[PDB]
Amino acid sequence: AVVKCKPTSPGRRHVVKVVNPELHKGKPFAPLLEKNSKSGGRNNNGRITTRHIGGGHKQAYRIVDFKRNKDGIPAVVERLEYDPNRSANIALVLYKDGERRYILAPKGLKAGDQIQSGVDAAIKPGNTLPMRNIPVGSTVHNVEMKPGKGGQLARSAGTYVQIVARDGAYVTLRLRSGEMRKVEADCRATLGEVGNAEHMLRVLGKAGAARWRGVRPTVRGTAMNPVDHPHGGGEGRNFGKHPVTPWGVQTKGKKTRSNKRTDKFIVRRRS
Amino acid sequence: MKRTFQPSVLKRNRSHGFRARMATKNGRQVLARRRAKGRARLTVSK
RNA sequence: AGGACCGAACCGACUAAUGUUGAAAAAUUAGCGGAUGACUUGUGGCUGGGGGUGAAAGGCCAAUCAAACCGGGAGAUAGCU
RNA sequence: GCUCGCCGGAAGACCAAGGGUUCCUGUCCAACGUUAAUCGGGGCAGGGUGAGUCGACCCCUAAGGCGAGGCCGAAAGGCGUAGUCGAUGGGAAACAGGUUAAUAUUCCUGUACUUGGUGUUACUGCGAAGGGGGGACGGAGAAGGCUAUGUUGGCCGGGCGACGGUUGUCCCGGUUUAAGCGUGUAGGCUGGUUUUCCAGGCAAAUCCGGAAAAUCAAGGCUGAGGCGUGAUGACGAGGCACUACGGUGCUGAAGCAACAAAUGCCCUGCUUCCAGGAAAAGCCUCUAAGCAUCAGGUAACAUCAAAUCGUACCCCAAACCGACACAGGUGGUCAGGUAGAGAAUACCAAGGCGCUUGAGAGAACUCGGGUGAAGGAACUAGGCAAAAUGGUGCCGUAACUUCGGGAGAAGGCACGCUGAUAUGUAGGUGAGGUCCCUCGCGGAUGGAGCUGAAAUCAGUCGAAGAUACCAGCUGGCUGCAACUGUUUAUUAAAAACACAGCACUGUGCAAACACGAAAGUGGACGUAUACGGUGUGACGCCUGCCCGGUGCCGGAAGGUUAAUU
RNA sequence: AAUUCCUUGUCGGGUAAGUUCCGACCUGCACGAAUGGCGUAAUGAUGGCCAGGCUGUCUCCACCCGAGACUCAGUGAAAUU
């Protein structure tokens, strides 16, 4: 649920929290944990390649099964756990053969629900099937770009993909961005949407909240100096030039897609 | 007032030690120059 | 519960005086700010000069920074002293 | 040697880092020491550092480094796999007393403990570069049970007072004892046991996971402290013989109880929150290939081994970093008494110091302070500085407001000591006794003893009772920025930067983008409720008109237009 | 007006006296709506202004306690020329 903090002090006045009582209030599944060392936005050369990254709370990676290749073995949802590595929640599912795995939690999933994967699986939320068997017009998530590569599209808190048409060996999808893209009609997809739709309603409320996420402060650019940024300085605030990134690219409408290997699978771009 | 030099033997050897100099071609050139000059102490090893 | 309150340690450096061949190449004394946090600190590691890093002052990068230091081109050139 | 003064959350004590003989003894005083010097961290000589248990080494790994082949690159070289290094982290074991001029958990005495090798005896499924478990982990908060430790009483030894009193409800000192072993308590967690089956754990598995039955309710694990033992010992205030008045043999009393109590321990617990909180080995199990009248495994006993290096001394400082015996800087551990909320503050204990020129004088002027007639900001760019306010309880408290605040608003009253209520109350603690019980570190009852606020009434001293140190000046209007934060180390702390929020725009993943001749890496083990860039800057009401210019995004007819031909 | 040159604009408030400050006026030299406009409780070692208290800030300095200054003994610099 969405709850607004009382203004007992500055920094809590505008805080809006998303509290889920159904989430597991305990330690995660140790066998599926892994070490996740922070990088600070620096590559193997030691240089900052992506700015505004650093600090934040320590996190342990959860091995989420994006492939869902366990076919024909029913699984039962044990509990839903908070995942610090992604906006969406995850569910610990116990297969009937005694195996436990982590999967993205769909919208209407809760403890005790039954899920299955394979060609013969039922058309219910949480089930993963190849898009060939998925009825046209269905809502799916964790879509696979290539057969067997694992889900890659629509994995955010409340995102989903709609199957628009099936033309032979390909199916046309409408992504959350509005793009119309086609993929082979053999990729796996999970029914339903991701069930953390309230995630977008949270309000951090204070600067320190962003620092917890590991986001370092952003310096605008119009106020540093001519040497550091094209927007430069000037006596007072001038900014008398076209908006531009560092390194000199416009970025106020200028497009930067230059793949040319894809775009055979792109029907419409967006908007 | 904290000053520039804060001694630490481990860091001293790792930065300017004999093995560190031998680890790279440029470092080996430093030893060659010092040997040619006749330096009594090649590095800060001890 | 809180980038909550008062206030030591701890971290800061707003005012004044002194000092200015100083006790000190930036400190002392009396007050002053934060003091569970975007906090602070030990050890080790990584980023190298038209480059790094920068909650952005052209700040900082060994008391040196609008392009560090050392060696070399080099006895640069100097219609100027 | 006797006084005086200073620090005492250190200006005491013990370490790391760093230094490297500054340690101890003898000797010397040229130089060094801001003076003298017989003295010294100075010169010279000699002597000092003793470990199976402390640390390193060693086993294990983090960030990261290196990196066989490999990929990439004019060369140099870059990146990286298998691997191998890398603590600031994980991993076996020793305590008390005594002792040296200088070392000790290292030597000595006493009493322990750990991991290995080998041997004998008995019983035996052993086996990993594999599987599983464990190791293994956040913030905040709340108590409860304890100890370190302190106070008082009791007990033991001593004392009877330089000046009135002091044989008593008087004064001084002591009242200490470890690891280990045994007990398994306050308290924390988890339902046990047995049988059958199984698409799971790269193969297997009796192990882990999963499923289905039956049977019992008591099983197990973890766990401070206490108690017993260790200990007929050691230590012990003070005696008695030696006694070069430097110090040794021997002997040596009491050695209990109550209360208070941690920031330390139970607690890697419990509760709760979102920002969701290392790895690997040792360790415990599981089997595979293999080996089975063997080898190995378990247990008992015996025996042997536990090497090597560090160990002096300083370590908030005269020994480290600052050229100095320099008002500087420097991480961890220990934490006594009275008052106090307190690690503030004042005075003290243990302990350590008076800071390496002094002696006089008592001018101007400067510095650091005390007081002040009358006036009270007339000073000045400006209340700069100074003065002032200052505590606890109770009463009381405005506009405005985002309903939290504003607020400790403002303002007012009471504070000492003595006695009584009450020979010390409410409360806390809790012995003896009685009873019960699965006869235990148990439960109930019981209230001795000890500890002990706060309040009321009465009395009483002073000019003054929050008397010292300590310890908010307050109120009114207004600009700017929402706020906490950040910044020119060394003249600028701000209205500047960040900021949550908002918007535009790019980005379908081999993403955009960035670092790289490249490989590759970051973005991200993320996937449009995501990520990058740009502007604005909480919140509230809002964000109007203009696309000619420049930019960006589309367009398809025509014109012009490179290499090439 | 952090923006107004003329300028100490004009009027009112506050003062015995107000180039500052506060409230209005609009003749905006040369405000203006995300290089955001206008408000805004709270916050601020932030800018301006006014009060109560307070005082050696001052009228106007006086005395006193310490460290120097001064004298004696020892040691023994510096810039400049």
Curated annotation (Swiss-Prot), chain A:
<dbReference type="Pfam" id="PF00181">
    <property type="entry name" value="Ribosomal_L2"/>
</dbReference>
<keyword id="KW-0694">RNA-binding</keyword>
<comment type="function">
    <text>In the E.coli 70S ribosome in the initiation state it has been modeled to make several contacts with the 16S rRNA (forming bridge B7b, PubMed:12809609); these contacts are broken in the model with bound EF-G.</text>
</comment>
<dbReference type="InterPro" id="IPR014726">
    <property type="entry name" value="Ribosomal_uL2_dom3"/>
</dbReference>
<keyword id="KW-0687">Ribonucleoprotein</keyword>
<comment type="subunit">
    <text>Part of the 50S ribosomal subunit. Forms a bridge to the 30S subunit in the 70S ribosome, contacting the 16S rRNA. Interacts weakly with S6 in one of the 3.5 A resolved structures. In pull-down experiments interacts with CedA.</text>
</comment>
<dbReference type="GO" id="GO:0019843">
    <property type="term" value="F:rRNA binding"/>
</dbReference>
<dbReference type="InterPro" id="IPR005880">
    <property type="entry name" value="Ribosomal_uL2_bac/org-type"/>
</dbReference>
<dbReference type="InterPro" id="IPR008991">
    <property type="entry name" value="Translation_prot_SH3-like_sf"/>
</dbReference>
<dbReference type="GO" id="GO:0002181">
    <property type="term" value="P:cytoplasmic translation"/>
</dbReference>
<dbReference type="InterPro" id="IPR022671">
    <property type="entry name" value="Ribosomal_uL2_CS"/>
</dbReference>
<feature type="compositionally biased region" description="Low complexity">
    <location>
        <begin position="38"/>
        <end position="47"/>
    </location>
</feature>
<comment type="similarity">
    <text>Belongs to the universal ribosomal protein uL2 family.</text>
</comment>
<comment type="function">
    <text>One of the primary rRNA binding proteins. Located near the base of the L1 stalk, it is probably also mobile. Required for association of the 30S and 50S subunits to form the 70S ribosome, for tRNA binding and peptide bond formation. It has been suggested to have peptidyltransferase activity; this is highly controversial.</text>
</comment>
<dbReference type="GO" id="GO:0008270">
    <property type="term" value="F:zinc ion binding"/>
</dbReference>
<dbReference type="GO" id="GO:0016740">
    <property type="term" value="F:transferase activity"/>
</dbReference>
<keyword id="KW-0007">Acetylation</keyword>
<dbReference type="InterPro" id="IPR012340">
    <property type="entry name" value="NA-bd_OB-fold"/>
</dbReference>
<dbReference type="InterPro" id="IPR022669">
    <property type="entry name" value="Ribosomal_uL2_C"/>
</dbReference>
<dbReference type="GO" id="GO:1990082">
    <property type="term" value="C:DnaA-L2 complex"/>
</dbReference>
<dbReference type="GO" id="GO:0005829">
    <property type="term" value="C:cytosol"/>
</dbReference>
<dbReference type="GO" id="GO:0003735">
    <property type="term" value="F:structural constituent of ribosome"/>
</dbReference>
Curated annotation (Swiss-Prot), chain B:
<dbReference type="InterPro" id="IPR000271">
    <property type="entry name" value="Ribosomal_bL34"/>
</dbReference>
<dbReference type="GO" id="GO:0003735">
    <property type="term" value="F:structural constituent of ribosome"/>
</dbReference>
<dbReference type="InterPro" id="IPR020939">
    <property type="entry name" value="Ribosomal_bL34_CS"/>
</dbReference>
<dbReference type="Pfam" id="PF00468">
    <property type="entry name" value="Ribosomal_L34"/>
</dbReference>
<keyword id="KW-0687">Ribonucleoprotein</keyword>
<dbReference type="GO" id="GO:0005840">
    <property type="term" value="C:ribosome"/>
</dbReference>
<keyword id="KW-0689">Ribosomal protein</keyword>
<protein>
    <recommendedName>
        <fullName>Large ribosomal subunit protein bL34</fullName>
    </recommendedName>
</protein>
<dbReference type="GO" id="GO:1990904">
    <property type="term" value="C:ribonucleoprotein complex"/>
</dbReference>
<dbReference type="GO" id="GO:0006412">
    <property type="term" value="P:translation"/>
</dbReference>
<comment type="similarity">
    <text>Belongs to the bacterial ribosomal protein bL34 family.</text>
</comment>
